[PDB]
Amino acid sequence: MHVNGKVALVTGAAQGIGRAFAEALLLKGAKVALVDWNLEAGVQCKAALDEQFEPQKTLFIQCDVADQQQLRDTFRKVVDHFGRLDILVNNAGVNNEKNWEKTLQINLVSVISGTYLGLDYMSKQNGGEGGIIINMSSLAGLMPVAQQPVYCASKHGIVGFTRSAALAANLMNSGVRLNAICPGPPLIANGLITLIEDDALNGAIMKITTSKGIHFQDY
Amino acid sequence: MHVNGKVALVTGAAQGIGRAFAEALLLKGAKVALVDWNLEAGVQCKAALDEQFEPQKTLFIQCDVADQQQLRDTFRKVVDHFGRLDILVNNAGVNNEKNWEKTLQINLVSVISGTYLGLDYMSKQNGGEGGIIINMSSLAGLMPVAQQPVYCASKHGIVGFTRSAALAANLMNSGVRLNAICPGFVLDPPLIANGLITLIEDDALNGAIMKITTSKGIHFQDY
Ligand SMILES: NC(=O)C1=CN([C@@H]2O[C@H](COP(=O)(O)OP(=O)(O)OC[C@H]3O[C@@H](n4cnc5c(N)ncnc54)[C@H](O)[C@@H]3O)[C@@H](O)[C@H]2O)C=CC1
Ligand SMILES: NC(=O)C1=CN([C@@H]2O[C@H](COP(=O)(O)OP(=O)(O)OC[C@H]3O[C@@H](n4cnc5c(N)ncnc54)[C@H](O)[C@@H]3O)[C@@H](O)[C@H]2O)C=CC1
């Protein structure tokens, strides 16, 4: 299908794979409100994105994805300034073992908050029409990385919550879709297009690796 | 190796599976510092416990596993009383989806904090002697529960952190072992305390996930 017209919210996209994601969506005809607190990097990201895209299809917001109030405000501003929402990308994350409290409050808590907000603003039952919510993870959620325990715990929690809430939505008949991405950056953003362009792929985990390009792991 | 004369600390033993754990230890002679938050369910457990075992082999300290200032003081007083520490058991848990913050703060954060405190108090690198640390998870950490996503998050996080910290301490040459056990839907509650002892028995196992199912009995996760 054509992703044109749709509205998307990608979290933490001022630099890196996050930013990459936006490009694809912007080049696919959608309109993206990048969300990240890296204002110095986010403004430059929007500037770079503009040169090949009309400036009304790129917005930016500043909110660290750790507080429910700020995340809710960001979602409200997205759906207001654009009128709706169809695509959610929860990818903001930090790699750190020392202050593992933050490592666990960022990767796992904020993904759940974002998915609940996406269900709220997209669940057929309570308005809207649905769409898709994708959470970004890594092999640490599927492999034990002895080097970084808390990282492995966060990724495992994400890859559990994704399936749980996908089953919940599928039982509630709410339109919202949930999927999880666990790769080994343009090839990474080539996964959003692969997943979003098929409504028969919900509540699953996909892997991007050098062995098989893009594929899906079967439980 | 030997279980007699050791010292163990099980969190949340005022009732249920927790209690089973404690009792089994006193069958094998290990001295135990019970910990839980429901003091009402704890004092009765203590009274029923010292009946079959000498008064001086057990103690109880009431605290929540999520308050760091309390989980440090519990370990400190336990070491002060028994003079050592060898076995740690993180069993505190709750099912709740309304205040979904607390499910994670309890099932996941408290386990990690207790494990780190135990490693500090047991690792050969800092004047300890060694022992074992054990964490309680469930099949929720290995299969999706429809209505309880935060519970799955906590269980999965515990599985990962155990399997990682075990190897982290193993390669450092610390001596301590870390493992996590998962029971079935409770299945005789004794069957879980019949498992805890097993972990303290064997010494060639580190970071093993034990699963209980009523079709084959007891097995371990495959990776
Ligand atoms: N580490 C890796 O190599 C892999 C990572 N991923 C996913 O990609 C994410 C990052 O990938 P990278 O390309 O390495 O980018 P990165 O981690 O270097 O980029 C982080 C960007 O997001 C922002 N950010 C991070 N956490 C945030 C938070 N809690 N609140 C607000 N802004 C936040 C940072 O300011 C920065 O703008 C990881 O979190 C994970 O989701 C996926 C597979 C492998
Ligand atoms: N609930 C069940 O029947 C089953 C439990 N499990 C696993 O076994 C663990 C123990 O469950 P049960 O013994 O059946 O529970 P229970 O319903 O018999 O009692 C819960 C125990 O946890 C303690 N506890 C709860 N939150 C605590 C906290 N924040 N700090 C300290 N202690 C706390 C309570 O004091 C009580 O001792 C569960 O956490 C779960 O990991 C798995 C399968 C079935």
Numbering used by the authors:
A (entry chain B): 1 to 184, 222 to 256
B (entry chain A): 1 to 186, 220 to 256
Task: Tell me what the authors wrote about this structure, in their words.
The enzyme 15-prostaglandin dehydrogenase (15-PGDH) is a key negative regulator of tissue stem cell activity in proliferation and in the repair of tissue injury, whose negative regulation of tissue regeneration is conserved across multiple organs. 15-PGDH acts via its NAD+-dependent enzymatic activity of oxidizing and degrading prostaglandin E2 (PGE2), and related eicosanoids, which provide key trophic support for stem cells in multiple tissues. Specifically, 15-PGDH catalyzes the rate-limiting step to initiate PGE2 degradation by oxidizing the 15-hydroxyl moiety of PGE2 to a 15-keto group, thereby inactivating PGE2 from being able to bind to its receptors. 15-PGDH assembled as a homodimer, which is the proposed physiological form of the enzyme.
To further define the predicted functional role of the 15-PGDH drug binding lid, we employed cryo-EM to solve the structure of the 15-PGDH-NADH complex in the absence of inhibitor. With a similar imaging processing workflow, we were able to resolve the apo-form to 3.3 Å. The cryo-EM map of the unliganded 15-PGDH shows clear differences from the (+)-SW209415-bound complex described above. In the absence of inhibitor, 15-PGDH forms a looser complex that lacks certain structural features because of enhanced dynamic flexibility. These features are apparent in the 2D class averages and localize mainly to the lid region of the inhibitor binding pocket. Thus, the MD simulations recapitulate the cryo-EM findings that the lid becomes disordered in the absence of inhibitor binding. In the absence of an inhibitor, our data indicate that this lid of 15-PGDH successively swings between open-and-closed states in solution.
